[PDB]
Amino acid sequence: DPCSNCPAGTFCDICSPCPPNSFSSAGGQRTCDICRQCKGVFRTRKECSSTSNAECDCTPGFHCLGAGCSMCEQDCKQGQELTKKGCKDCSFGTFNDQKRGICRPWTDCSLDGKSVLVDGTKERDVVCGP
């Protein structure tokens, strides 16, 4: 109650503003949260403020995974997929059109009762002719 007036940017114990490298998102807090820091492969997208957390993306050659970019995952080329042992070319039959994710099998045109209008590649799916 006394504290509910301590506004965002501060905590209560007496409304001391947030320490360095600390923030408070709303008024009323009995403490400020420590700021995420963007280290190694994580680059700073938005600096920490007294009322907002730091935001991180990834250095070029990596890309963000997870809610709020909790992980940086190495890129590969179209026609590859990342593995526990690095970028591998797509096996014949499979394609990746992005710098992330897995090689996916070509479409089976026979199944939907159609011919392969155009052959696939390690970057593009086949195209079927109805």
Binding site: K39, V41, G66, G68, M71, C72, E73, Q74, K84
Partner: peptide, 15 residues
């Protein structure tokens, strides 16, 4: 998904 290592880094603030 691949394991955390030299190809994928986890920010332990988040993780």
């Amino acid at each position: 998904c691949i394991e955390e290592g030299q190809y994928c880094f986890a920010d332990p603030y988040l993780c």
